[PDB]
Design a protein around this ligand. Structure first.
Ligand SMILES: Cc1sc2c(c1C)[C@@H](c1ccc(Cl)cc1)N[C@@H](CC(=O)NC[C@]13C[C@H]4C[C@H](C[C@H](C4)C1)C3)c1nnc(C)n1-2
Length: 127
């Protein structure tokens, strides 16, 4: 069995900038979800080899995890907040697509997604 390479977190060809919205996404949103008791399955790519999930990367074609998001934010990989918000929504969506309702990992994603929603509701206006 083999894992795919992870999503890129560095690419000099990609336009990027610092925004106050991206600063919020690191200092408030990522920091809140990372420290949560349910963060740990989401803090690095799914290891489909060690978890014995040989179908995972047949069903999940756009993988994403908060380890990737954290490096993207710390490396200033994004152009705008919408790109980073899309990564969070991909991560949650992938968990719901692969798993079934009421599975423990779905309850964990739901608890993280509720905090995510509460924090991005107060995303600051761009300066
Ligand atoms: C490190 C990761 S990543 C990750 C899991 C783990 C352990 C993780 C997980 C699981 C439980 C907790 Cl508390 C927590 C997490 N889940 C995986 C998906 C997965 O293994 N599915 C297989 C089954 C796991 C269980 C339940 C069903 C019946 C049995 C036993 C097999 C399905 C997964 N998906 N998305 C992500 C992200 N994960």
């Amino acid at each position: 069995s083999m894992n795919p390479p992870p999503p890129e977190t560095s690419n000099p060809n990609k336009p990027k900038r610092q925004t106050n919205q991206l600063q919020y996404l690191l200092r408030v949103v990522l920091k809140t979800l990372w420290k949560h008791q349910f963060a740990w399955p989401f803090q690095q790519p799914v290891d489909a080899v060690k978890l014995n999930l040989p179908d995972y990367y047949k069903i999940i074609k756009t993988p994403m995890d908060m380890g990737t998001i954290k490096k993207r934010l710390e490396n200033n990989y994004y152009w705008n907040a919408q790109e980073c918000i899309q990564d969070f929504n991909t991560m949650f969506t992938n968990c719901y697509i692969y798993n079934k309702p009421g599975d423990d990992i779905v309850l964990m994603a739901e608890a993280l997604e509720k905090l995510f929603l509460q924090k991005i509701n107060e995303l600051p206006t761009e300066e």
